[PDB]
Design a binder for this molecule. Structure first.
Ligand SMILES: NC(=O)c1ccc[n+]([C@@H]2O[C@H](COP(=O)([O-])OP(=O)(O)OC[C@H]3O[C@@H](n4cnc5c(N)ncnc54)[C@H](O)[C@@H]3O)[C@@H](O)[C@H]2O)c1
Ligand SMILES: NC(=O)c1ccc[n+]([C@@H]2O[C@H](COP(=O)([O-])OP(=O)(O)OC[C@H]3O[C@@H](n4cnc5c(N)ncnc54)[C@H](O)[C@@H]3O)[C@@H](O)[C@H]2O)c1
Ligand SMILES: Nc1nc2c(ncn2[C@@H]2O[C@H](COP(=O)(O)OP(=O)(O)OP(=O)(O)O)[C@@H](O)[C@H]2O)c(=O)[nH]1
Ligand SMILES: Nc1nc2c(ncn2[C@@H]2O[C@H](COP(=O)(O)OP(=O)(O)OP(=O)(O)O)[C@@H](O)[C@H]2O)c(=O)[nH]1
Ligand SMILES: Nc1nc2c(ncn2[C@@H]2O[C@H](COP(=O)(O)OP(=O)(O)OP(=O)(O)O)[C@@H](O)[C@H]2O)c(=O)[nH]1
Ligand SMILES: Nc1nc2c(ncn2[C@@H]2O[C@H](COP(=O)(O)OP(=O)(O)OP(=O)(O)O)[C@@H](O)[C@H]2O)c(=O)[nH]1
Ligand SMILES: Nc1ncnc2c1ncn2[C@@H]1O[C@H](COP(=O)(O)OP(=O)(O)OP(=O)(O)O)[C@@H](O)[C@H]1O
Ligand SMILES: Nc1ncnc2c1ncn2[C@@H]1O[C@H](COP(=O)(O)OP(=O)(O)OP(=O)(O)O)[C@@H](O)[C@H]1O
Ligand SMILES: O=c1[nH]cnc2c1ncn2[C@@H]1O[C@H](COP(=O)(O)O)[C@@H](O)[C@H]1O
Ligand SMILES: O=c1[nH]cnc2c1ncn2[C@@H]1O[C@H](COP(=O)(O)O)[C@@H](O)[C@H]1O
Lengths: 519, 519, 103
């Protein structure tokens, strides 16, 4: 368990020169009671959203950089950062899902596409960083230089081992890389690969059955770009690439499986066709599934959870969108590994004014997360996240991870093109029930647009630093400590009137121009 | 009664594989308590309007299309859809009242007109769709072709049976339709109808005393447009027309009486003059009456209710406007068959800031409907209905039907013309106390304008799909089940702070553009 | 389809070089939108009546006569300064609401 502000302060006093006190209480020192407990804040029976309250500051005895952001995504998946990219077609295809997994979050690929398109986008995420490359691009020596350029333009891989048959089930005869085809003139689609490959007698190779680390040290000291791995009869078993050692050095938080591939999630619906779609995604090596619906407490979703759990029992499933403990119960009881929380919040949404249904998102995160922790189930807080203060509030109220749409929209890794709407660079961002993309067919989203924010790799470390500094002013040394302080009543809250929200912002300045972060 | 979310979920589990539980309670399974009951929401003693609360989502085990929207309008009238057009001069003359009754609602014709104009607009509604046409347009053969074109331009009917004397009580001698006068040149007002009519020896006719379904089958297999009905002495009793079989096929929800005529309501005031008006409206065949006043709990209105009930005892009467149970009591006790609820809500209204009187419309619907169900009396929620979410909320709080002004204004079927005011197409919409149309003479309305929305026949199925999808996310199979869940405490509500209303809308998008429905 | 963008009914209208619907590929159109105008069968007779009344006020019995007066020098023109374009519009009214045509 955590240690109290009184215990920490008392310990820092015991580290310096500055009796019967331990006998009166002991460890439980006096702190004057101020603000509300989360139990008391929500006992009010009014719909509170992230703007309607504040967190009171604590006691600081660590630097903001020591703050641990490690988070459970599901019963069995842990991420080094609380951040998830929302499965929408204007937010997350493979470029976004790679960028989010590299910065220590995850992406879920959207399903407003064909089953084969979605499984191919998952396959692009899983192939980006590698331990042993077990299914490399291999060519036969009767091929041309034109084939090596076409392979580079079709996959993107310039380093191609050459085996006799042209598959892994064969003897290695050489390697072709970019540096031995790059200078060739346009007399390409004539020249055979035996004329250009570095031949197998010149190669540094390692014997099959080496661990990934032994093989790393062989490749590392060899100064080569690739290391082929070969069996006792001299056949090609795998390759490894120094690029992945560079990627590893460059991204110390990256969310990876045991094969050193990035983690990827995907969405599916609750139709019969989603059963086939799920089979392609599991063949593509997907790590976790979202069941992606406005109202997840349905007989159709509970059927699809039981189907996934009976067919792919090692696969992780997140139950859909819920806002009440009564909804969360039937999906936790159906056997989900996590839940998505939010309905009608979300910047592009109109569900509340179309359907009458929804809930205020601070209340929904608190009520669903307080119910879900009784069973050990993690919560994703989804939509309404406009600031790093909303992320810190969502995490403080009991969410394990936060899922963002509009905050990640109009980054360089978000799908589509910029188009410069109205004297601003301004990219498109639509919602999935938007009727802009897909019997009267009612809309539930609004087909809007968002300002440019540059790369995820520059914007997510701003989120991480904001969350860590928020935890430091609270006095929480990790996100697990922050939630422990909240359920214990140590974390205190204050409500805001309207004027309190106004004085928290920027007042009667004439001009106003904040710079978010400077590096 | 109705079956609960716990009972339904348990039943859907018993349809598959996935004990003391029945002995501990049985049927009343555990659901965690979350949100407020309607009785607890309104116990707050604060004026809540449709924007200040949300409905929490339930359990789904049916498709949204199964949702039954059948509603009581009065103690004795039932409509296949909850929707009513408000009796205002910029909303509802006969074109609107026909369009609303065809889509399974009703219209009440406005009274900012003469008694003879209002009775003629009712008569136009009652004539649009027909079983037996019992007093058809008839001519003598001694009329001219010019008289048939004049009849077509004065009534709108082309199929004119010809009887000797020229009335529906004389020997049939032929029929004239459009196809036997349409090609005639401008030598019209000379030629006798005997020269053009299909003669009685050529006609398909049916014997008087057939049922409507027997006559339908005879007309149907004949492939003619009309079927005359004739008695033993071969005089014209009635006609039927295949055009009405097409109307019946084309509009499966249409609100019809036993004679297969559309239902129509009308407004009258509480002055002594309104008795003559009421005589003419009942002559025209009107089905139901509104008594149309800002404050219905008056001695004048209670007089007029007693007069209508003593004179036309089969006629249905709706009480004025009320917002308190103390008002509702004296009108229910005077013997009304329904109540109109709302005062100072309504988009064009200023009565609250002029008179100091009114009530917040969510509270008023709840308090009046909760009092009125004790006596079996239906409620109309009137005014403030800006969205399909407001309709679902009004119905959930206990209204049986919803009456709309500004939402139906600036459709094609609403009275007046468009006039393109300020770069927007903008039809007129005014309120009935506008002083634009009806001592110092104080105004209570504001003479504004509303954007074009096309046909009622395209816009009402959008309302219907929105209400059905709203019921589906709530988990209600019908509007009766929705109100039963509300009075039982199964239906749960949350209040909204102002920031909760903000996050329910559209956030910091730059551009924003929602298509409401796609077909 | 109409899509109701900002409290106005709002059908789409683009230009054929708009890069919205078709090497740097330079764009030459802008992909805007236009307010609802109803049917061609109701709007074209307003155009026809406006053209006929314009010809009548000019004194021309047909469009061939109108062009014949122009090439002959019988048809006369006046230039407009900017203030002349302003007085040809609607002036210092507070509210303004023209009905185009009414059958
Ligand atoms: N979280 C939100 O607040 C929210 C709100 C609206 C839409 N969305 C998103 O929009 C997208 C579309 O999903 P959706 O929300 O329209 O719900 P959905 O696509 O799951 O279901 C749409 C409709 O079909 C029904 N349905 C689903 N599976 C069915 C089955 N097997 N048989 C019969 N009927 C079935 C549902 O009950 C509902 O009426 C998703 O990305 C979703 O997450 C999200
Ligand atoms: N519901 C609302 O919030 C609201 C508010 C204002 C107006 N309106 C509408 O505008 C219109 C006018 O409303 P109104 O209340 O002015 O109509 P009204 O005719 O009831 O009011 C007429 C005035 O004279 C009185 N009066 C009515 N009958 C009388 C009689 N027999 N003898 C003597 N005095 C009599 C009334 O008490 C009132 O002061 C109606 O269409 C009504 O629905 C609605
Ligand atoms: N070839 C290869 N080796 C890797 C990769 N990622 C990690 N390794 C190696 O596996 C061992 C793992 O050590 P770390 O990299 O510190 O830990 P990690 O958890 O695997 O990855 P990070 O979370 O990125 O630090 C080291 O020997 C690494 O060189 C990769 O993508 N490819
Ligand atoms: N060569 C190769 N790399 C693969 C393959 N599958 C995945 N990769 C990854 O792609 C990267 C290697 O790309 P290469 O084309 O070989 O070139 P590189 O060595 O990265 O050199 P640069 O691209 O110039 O930096 C590594 O991160 C590999 O893990 C494959 O079949 N062949
Ligand atoms: N002909 C006729 N129709 C009547 C009369 N009263 C009501 N109607 C209705 O008026 C409508 C028009 O009738 P007609 O003019 O005969 O033409 P129609 O048979 O509907 O066929 P259309 O020419 O396609 O409109 C029908 O829907 C009838 O139900 C009446 O006296 N004569
Ligand atoms: N002539 C005529 N027959 C009708 C009309 N409406 C229904 N019918 C007939 O009445 C009988 C009952 O049909 P239903 O399917 O029950 O029609 P309905 O419920 O009365 O009316 P809808 O709600 O319009 O379907 C059939 O013989 C119909 O053809 C009508 O307006 N005119
Ligand atoms: N394991 C190996 N043993 C021997 N030679 C190798 C081995 N792997 C690659 N080569 C050869 O070494 C040279 C450089 O290969 P490398 O993979 O580093 O090239 P590259 O990735 O195209 O270089 P660059 O990064 O500059 O573009 C090539 O001639 C290539 O065929
Ligand atoms: N019951 C009948 N028996 C015999 N002939 C009939 C009968 N009813 C109509 N006719 C004749 O049949 C012809 C077509 O009549 P119908 O009512 O179908 O025409 P219509 O509705 O005016 O045609 P349209 O829809 O094309 O405008 C006319 O010559 C008409 O006089
Ligand atoms: O069209 C839509 N209507 C309603 N909710 C949507 C729609 N599309 C996505 N959402 C939700 O909006 C969330 C993103 O909200 P945002 O981060 O505030 O922009 C998503 O993760 C979904 O839960
Ligand atoms: O002039 C007026 N003043 C006050 N209330 C009016 C007036 N005319 C109509 N109303 C009310 O306004 C309702 C329509 O409200 P709306 O649907 O919000 O536009 C009507 O059904 C009447 O109850």
């Amino acid at each position: 368990g955590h240690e109290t502000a009184a215990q920490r302060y008392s310990a820092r006093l015991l580290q310096a020169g500055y009796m019967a006190d331990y006998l009166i209480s002991g460890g439980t020192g006096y702190v004057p009671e101020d603000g509300l407990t989360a139990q008391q804040l929500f006992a009010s029976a009014d719909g509170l959203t992230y703007n309607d309250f504040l967190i009171l500051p604590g006691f600081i005895d660590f630097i903001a950089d020591e703050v641990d952001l490690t988070s459970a995504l599901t019963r069995k998946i842990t991420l080094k950062t609380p951040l998830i990219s929302s499965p929408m077609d204007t937010v997350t295809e493979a470029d976004m899902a790679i960028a989010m997994a590299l910065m220590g979050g995850i992406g879920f690929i959207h399903h407003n596409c064909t089953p084969e398109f979605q499984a191919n986008e998952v396959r692009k995420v899983k192939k980006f960083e590698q331990g042993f490359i077990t299914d490399p691009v291999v060519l036969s020596p009767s091929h041309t230089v034109g084939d090596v350029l076409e392979a580079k333009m079709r996959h993107g891989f310039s380093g191609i081992p050459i085996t006799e048959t042209g598959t892994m089930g064969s003897k290695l005869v050489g390697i072709v890389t970019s540096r031995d085809i790059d200078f060739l003139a346009e007399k390409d689609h004539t020249t055979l690969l035996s004329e250009v490959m570095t031949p197998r007698i010149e190669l540094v190779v390692a014997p099959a059955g080496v661990t990934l680390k032994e093989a790393n040290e062989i490749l590392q000291r060899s100064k080569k770009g690739k290391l082929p791995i070969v069996n006792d009869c001299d056949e090609l078993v795998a390759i490894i690439a120094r690029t992945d050692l560079k990627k590893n050095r460059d991204y110390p938080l990256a969310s990876k499986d045991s094969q050193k591939q990035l983690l990827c999630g995907a969405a599916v619906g609750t139709r019969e066709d989603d059963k086939y779609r799920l089979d392609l995604l599991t063949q593509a090596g997907v790590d976790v599934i979202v069941l992606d619906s406005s109202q997840g407490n349905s007989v159709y979703q509970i059927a699809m959870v039981h189907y996934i759990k009976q067919k792919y029992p090692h696969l992780q499933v997140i139950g859909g969108n819920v806002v009440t403990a009564a909804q969360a119960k039937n999906l936790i009881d159906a056997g989900v590994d996590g839940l998505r929380v939010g309905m009608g919040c979300g910047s592009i949404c109109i569900t509340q004014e179309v359907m009458a249904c929804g809930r205020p998102q601070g209340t929904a995160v608190y009520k669903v997360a307080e119910y879900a922790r009784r069973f050990g189930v993690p919560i994703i807080a989804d939509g309404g996240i406009q600031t790093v203060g909303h992320v810190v509030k969502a995490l403080a109220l009991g969410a394990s991870t936060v899922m963002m749409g509009s905050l990640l929209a109009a980054t360089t890794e978000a799908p589509g093109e910029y188009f410069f709407s109205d004297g601003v660079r301004l990219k498109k961002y639509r919602g999935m029930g938007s009727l802009d993309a897909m019997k009267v067919k009612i809309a539930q989203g609004v087909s809007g647009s968002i300002q440019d924010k540059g790369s995820i790799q520059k914007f997510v470390p701003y989120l991480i630093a904001g969350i860590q500094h928020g935890c430091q002013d609270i006095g929480a040394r990790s996100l697990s400590v922050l939630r422990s302080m909240m359920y214990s009543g140590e974390l205190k809250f204050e409500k805001r009137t309207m004027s309190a929200q106004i004085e928290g912002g920027v007042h009667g300045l004439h001009s106003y121009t904040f710079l978010p972060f400077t590096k």
